[PDB]
Amino acid sequence: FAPIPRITWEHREVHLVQFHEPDIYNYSALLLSEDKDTLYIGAREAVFAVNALNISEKQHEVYWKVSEDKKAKCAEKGKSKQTECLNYIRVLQPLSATSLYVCGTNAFQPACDHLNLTSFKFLGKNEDGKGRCPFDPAHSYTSVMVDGELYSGTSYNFLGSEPIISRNSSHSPLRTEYAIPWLNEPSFVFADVIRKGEDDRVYFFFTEVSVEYEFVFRVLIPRIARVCKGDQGGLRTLQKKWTSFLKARLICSRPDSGLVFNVLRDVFVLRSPGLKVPVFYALFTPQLNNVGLSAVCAYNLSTAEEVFSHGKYMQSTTVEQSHTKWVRYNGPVPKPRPGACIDSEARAANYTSSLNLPDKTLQFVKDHPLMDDSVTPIDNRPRLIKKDVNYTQIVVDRTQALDGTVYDVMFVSTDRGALHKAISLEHAVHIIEETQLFQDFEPVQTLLLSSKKGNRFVYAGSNSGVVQAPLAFCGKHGTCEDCVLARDPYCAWSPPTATCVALHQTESPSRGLIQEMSGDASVCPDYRQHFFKHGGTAELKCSQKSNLARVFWKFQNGVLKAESPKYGLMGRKNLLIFNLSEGDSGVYQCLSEERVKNKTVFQVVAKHVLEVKV
Amino acid sequence: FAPIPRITWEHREVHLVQFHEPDIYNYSALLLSEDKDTLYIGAREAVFAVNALNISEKQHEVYWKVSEDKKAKCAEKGKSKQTECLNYIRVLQPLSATSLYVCGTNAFQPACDHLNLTSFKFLGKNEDGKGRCPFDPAHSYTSVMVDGELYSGTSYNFLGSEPIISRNSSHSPLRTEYAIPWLNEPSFVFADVIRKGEDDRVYFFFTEVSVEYEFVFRVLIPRIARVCKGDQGGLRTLQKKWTSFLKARLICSRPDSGLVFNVLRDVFVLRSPGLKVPVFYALFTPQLNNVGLSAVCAYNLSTAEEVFSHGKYMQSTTVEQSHTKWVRYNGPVPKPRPGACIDSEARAANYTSSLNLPDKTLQFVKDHPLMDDSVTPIDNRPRLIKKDVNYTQIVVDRTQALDGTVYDVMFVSTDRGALHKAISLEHAVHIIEETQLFQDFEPVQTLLLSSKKGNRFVYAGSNSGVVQAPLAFCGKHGTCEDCVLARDPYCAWSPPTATCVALHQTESPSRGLIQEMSGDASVCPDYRQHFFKHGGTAELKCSQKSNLARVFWKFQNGVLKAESPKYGLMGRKNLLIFNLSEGDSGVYQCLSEERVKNKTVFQVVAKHVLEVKV
């Protein structure tokens, strides 16, 4: 299990910019512009444009509030008039340079519209968002705009009994089948297009009730799925339906410890400036006995692609003679491959679209959407497993250290408004710091990263507002030792400026900078006076930031024992000399000790010169 | 989830009698005599007889140490010469008035013998305990002596690859089949005879790899099983094999919370003086994501009896065409019923023993040992679910309160040498107290209850020694309020003696005693002076035992705020007045507040009269 966050930053001790509109709640949708300087917020009954560099600067505002006759219609359907019967923005996507595509629950009448960016006024397109947007603010939902066409995963109805992964195309509308083999009680988590003869694919991530597994209760299972951008459906069968829909198990577990995380919470696509293949960073929690635990598994796209392209499918079979069981299909697979895209191979066999695929192949995919092979993580284990924390959303920044060693920086939000910064150091997790983003411990519902030159920020939304944080707080570190010991690839010590700087931001010289991810503060170069009355009591204040260090006191060059009657420890860090007399005068030193590898790192926290009067 | 233990007793603050022999370890077997005054301890390479009333009084001792040629033989087989290659006592059972039946691992040569009680010397019977006793001190094991015949569940071999539930009878030896349907990687937990035409039954409890369930990893499942005392095996088939072996799922879970506890740790049989039917109190932990959690489920014997007597069996089937799946069997069941005992019905159809049962019935049971129905707990939920605690063994005492309301008192041991006392109050768990039995936090391996008049004790064994504790510490409670607030059915307040007494032990008058399980201390009838120097500092000590209460201070009839500079709180309970002056003199009161139901209970903990000198 991952250790405790090395340093805890109170909302008070760091520079965090906040945004909220009075009487406006549920800041669940976040979208930043092309230029990255304008962040758009989708809340309950409102859409805003804020300066992404200072979220507190409100630029534009637009509302989409529900009428009383629509609220009462919703309430008459036994829903909560002042809770669920309101317009929760669920779809906030780029449409053009001059517009956004917006959908809201709208007292259970999913409605879509175009937000005119030049005016920040809605165009009144008033489209029926049934299938595109959920009815209930409680229902799961995911959407990705690909080539001005919305690819959405949510419920097709009011009750949330009909799930749907569909494309609102207008030219070629396509949707999933309303069948258990296709989708079995899913809870949508994330979707994105993975761009390139070879066609683009639109991946979907969700948790659904498993068909392959049987246990005491119904077992959930994380799913990775994909569809082909060029899909047009089948001609005779799969009319207006996906022909390219294949899914597989997403497995996040440490078995030598019986830890299985079968509930997917978030998915982030690490788009490597260097690496040609994207890495999905997926966030999971266990369905069973969650108390709570969180795990972060990283999946190489190539792995998943290997399953969808060459993996054996699963067959459903009748078993004695009213039951259905699912097993590996070892029978003959049709050609062209069921679920495959219109690639170079297909085009050679005179196949231009799904509309001209053989009925043999189309029937196969319709009856075999599920793959036998699981999609496994890189190094076949989670990147991080944490206890006593319920992680909510994830973002990852691939950063180059001073050394040139590349670290994948994990920003993980909690259900209590906190953000953890973690890196997988040499075969062990290091949680650099934790920051309390929300003073009200509101769970971070959404998280969004901008790693772009200048505007390097993380944006977190909750029901109470939005928070803007940098990727590091290098300046909070006082000494070179403190700067190095942090083991943050973002932070380096600058001897000329006598400040711990943010490497890859500051205008300090690279060649003349200090950073050691080993934590060996050895690479570094290197008195509060008091006058108290006789008989009186002294409180010598001492504090440090490491949650992984312990402090001890020293008087007259010896390790002082804070025991009654002469001594006491107030708050485990502040020394208390009780009965002051001639001999108590002199130097009192507060020291810290923290283990890095095998070695211990002692640091002098406080220096005190106590003088007792006569 | 169950709250935290109301009061924590340090090993220091309670009267606990301890026993251990220098250089003797692993005190895993405990057996008390008929008279209940002599407790026999089975350790590694030794057996002792101690006064059960004062375990520290060693009465008798006997050793059974392994020879160097036997240790070296064991070590040559790649085992640990100074760890596993020693005689761990595994079987410590009553044989007669003048003898005990003892088996030890014996450097992987399971050996049995008779301990002559009149001499406390072994008889040298030197029986081969293969099947009766495990080879490895790591292997699971269970045994019950029924009518001078040992019924044992353990491994049949060195590697622990062959499991076995068998009867060392001499007249009619019987054992299980070495087949997955019968036993699939079991870990034995407990066994006992459930006594009465109707035959007696010998129940077995264990955890084994499930055949009915399929998940990411192999799923374990707790099992309740039984065999008939009168079994003699089959004549043509099941030659020297159990014909009465039936098993079923033992289910301990809260599903509205996704909590499943599929690993059985201990089983206790509540033999009710009043209730005609015994209740099994079973202790479970989860296989998946245990961090750790413990649950206590109580099962009514009648329920289990209903499954074994009328439940539909499970069939194994071939599925496409190399796999095996298990489903409910809805086909024709033979008569006499497979797995049933030789009852009144069978005897009418001229069946005297298993040896004369039709081959039809015998073949059925051999191919269908597993039942389709699960054995569920009373009120279909656990009696207790606890987090942050790994419970090891359980005992239950059915006790009558002053009111006459019967409480089933749960004594639960932990893997850190602690004992919790819990009762299921009105639809909520109340953990009365917790006691640190082992100063070395050694896990309690075995637990044994003597609820008998006079000698009312709990005996706990660990690798470091044995501990003797009473069932209550009524005397530790100071006031009537404190006595009542404890909500311990064992404790009552005595106004004449001004002491909190143990109801059903003391010679105090029943009619003139105070006890309220509601916790309403309203039924009850109803100054440390200091003189400190001017300018000096005062520490006003205040403490109480409730882990569920918080203390606040009062000065000059007002709730004082322990904030800098004038005030401070040392250890969250001790008040610190910093700069003494004329006005600081007077009465300082430490008060406690604890919620019972809705209401708060304020109590005056400490009274102080502080006088500041001039």
Ligand SMILES: *[C@@H]1O[C@H](CO)[C@@H](O[C@@H]2O[C@H](CO)[C@@H](O[C@@H]3O[C@H](CO)[C@@H](O)[C@H](O)[C@@H]3O)[C@H](O)[C@H]2NC(C)=O)[C@H](O)[C@H]1NC(C)=O
């Ligand atoms: C994600 O999965 C892809 C799929 O294989 C990984 O890519 C491949 O990794 C292998 C492993 O070495 C490469 O093979 C060879 O690399 C050595 C190293 O220099 C080279 O000397 C050999 O001549 C050969 O090229 C393979 O080329 C490479 N292919 C691609 C397209 O990347 C990828 O590394 C995985 N990424 C992660 C983070 O797991």
Ligand SMILES: *[C@@H]1O[C@H](CO)[C@@H](O[C@@H]2O[C@H](CO)[C@@H](O[C@@H]3O[C@H](CO)[C@@H](O)[C@H](O)[C@@H]3O)[C@H](O)[C@H]2NC(C)=O)[C@H](O)[C@H]1NC(C)=O
């Ligand atoms: C949108 O944001 C608002 C802002 O907090 C969320 O409001 C909160 O709603 C919950 C109920 O869903 C309130 O909890 C209470 O639950 C008990 C249980 O029955 C009920 O008896 C109480 O009357 C109350 O509803 C919570 O107090 C409330 N917060 C505030 C400040 O009023 C809202 O739930 C969010 N909606 C979504 C879809 O996230």
Ligand SMILES: *[C@@H]1O[C@H](CO)[C@@H](O[C@@H]2O[C@H](CO)[C@@H](O[C@@H]3O[C@H](CO)[C@@H](O)[C@H](O)[C@@H]3O)[C@H](O)[C@H]2NC(C)=O)[C@H](O)[C@H]1NC(C)=O
């Ligand atoms: C354990 O399971 C047994 C199996 O049923 C339970 O025993 C039975 O409980 C029923 C429930 O009432 C008894 O039926 C009736 O009880 C009422 C109460 O006075 C009486 O007025 C009716 O005339 C009738 O007797 C049934 O007789 C009883 N049978 C036996 C053998 O006990 C038992 O109570 C369960 N114990 C626990 C702790 O769950």
Ligand SMILES: *[C@@H]1O[C@H](CO)[C@@H](O[C@@H]2O[C@H](CO)[C@@H](O[C@@H]3O[C@H](CO)[C@@H](O)[C@H](O)[C@@H]3O)[C@H](O)[C@H]2NC(C)=O)[C@H](O)[C@H]1NC(C)=O
């Ligand atoms: C019987 O009781 C003794 C008394 O404590 C138990 O002794 C303990 O045995 C464990 C190993 O099983 C020792 O732990 C260590 O494990 C590491 C891991 O490789 C190893 O490198 C060390 O050399 C050592 O073996 C533990 O220190 C030891 N306790 C003492 C005081 O020596 C014994 O395990 C118990 N046997 C059974 C079957 O319960």
Ligand SMILES: *[C@@H]1O[C@H](CO)[C@@H](O[C@@H]2O[C@H](CO)[C@@H](O)[C@H](O)[C@H]2NC(C)=O)[C@H](O)[C@H]1NC(C)=O
């Ligand atoms: C989007 O909003 C802009 C903002 O007004 C609209 O711009 C006006 O467009 C009309 C022609 O249609 C011009 O005559 C006005 O002078 C424009 N005003 C401004 C301030 O630019 C634009 O038309 C809107 N687009 C749509 C589709 O409604």
Ligand SMILES: *[C@@H]1O[C@H](CO)[C@@H](O[C@@H]2O[C@H](CO)[C@@H](O)[C@H](O)[C@H]2NC(C)=O)[C@H](O)[C@H]1NC(C)=O
């Ligand atoms: C969602 O589907 C509707 C259904 O057609 C699309 O609506 C058409 O939109 C185009 C402009 O993009 C208009 O020219 C057509 O006249 C519209 N027809 C109808 C019937 O509405 C809509 O554009 C789709 N939206 C997205 C984001 O894909």
Ligand SMILES: *[C@@H]1O[C@H](CO)[C@@H](O[C@@H]2O[C@H](CO)[C@@H](O)[C@H](O)[C@H]2NC(C)=O)[C@H](O)[C@H]1NC(C)=O
């Ligand atoms: C982690 O999240 C779980 C829920 O997923 C929390 O468990 C709930 O805690 C509340 C608080 O009293 C209880 O009322 C609920 O009944 C609990 N539900 C379940 C399923 O346990 C858990 O407390 C959280 N823990 C941490 C460390 O974040």
Ligand SMILES: *[C@@H]1O[C@H](CO)[C@@H](O[C@@H]2O[C@H](CO)[C@@H](O)[C@H](O)[C@H]2NC(C)=O)[C@H](O)[C@H]1NC(C)=O
């Ligand atoms: C059990 O131990 C007792 C203790 O000695 C044995 O008792 C002796 O028995 C012999 C006859 O066999 C008598 O002559 C001795 O006088 C007895 N001595 C005592 C002290 O009682 C007894 O024999 C042992 N039982 C077995 C089976 O060996």
Ligand SMILES: *[C@@H]1O[C@H](CO)[C@@H](O[C@@H]2O[C@H](CO)[C@@H](O)[C@H](O)[C@H]2NC(C)=O)[C@H](O)[C@H]1NC(C)=O
């Ligand atoms: C375990 O099985 C052995 C096998 O027979 C039993 O041994 C017999 O024990 C009786 C006395 O109980 C002797 O009279 C016989 O001569 C013994 N025969 C053999 C071959 O040993 C043994 O008693 C059984 N033990 C238990 C506790 O049931």
Ligand SMILES: *[C@@H]1O[C@H](CO)[C@@H](O[C@@H]2O[C@H](CO)[C@@H](O)[C@H](O)[C@H]2NC(C)=O)[C@H](O)[C@H]1NC(C)=O
């Ligand atoms: C409860 O028991 C579990 C084991 O069943 C403990 O978990 C182990 O804790 C040690 C301590 O560092 C680790 O080294 C092991 O790797 C852990 N194993 C597993 C499977 O988690 C757990 O810490 C115990 N917790 C409590 C509160 O008793």
Ligand SMILES: *[C@@H]1O[C@H](CO)[C@@H](O)[C@H](O)[C@H]1NC(C)=O
């Ligand atoms: C932008 O941030 C600065 C930094 O303190 C602040 O002074 C300024 O008022 C902010 N702008 C707005 C509109 O809040």
Ligand SMILES: *[C@@H]1O[C@H](CO)[C@@H](O)[C@H](O)[C@H]1NC(C)=O
């Ligand atoms: C029995 O317990 C008493 C109580 O203190 C003790 O004094 C006595 O020595 C114990 N007996 C033995 C043999 O330890």
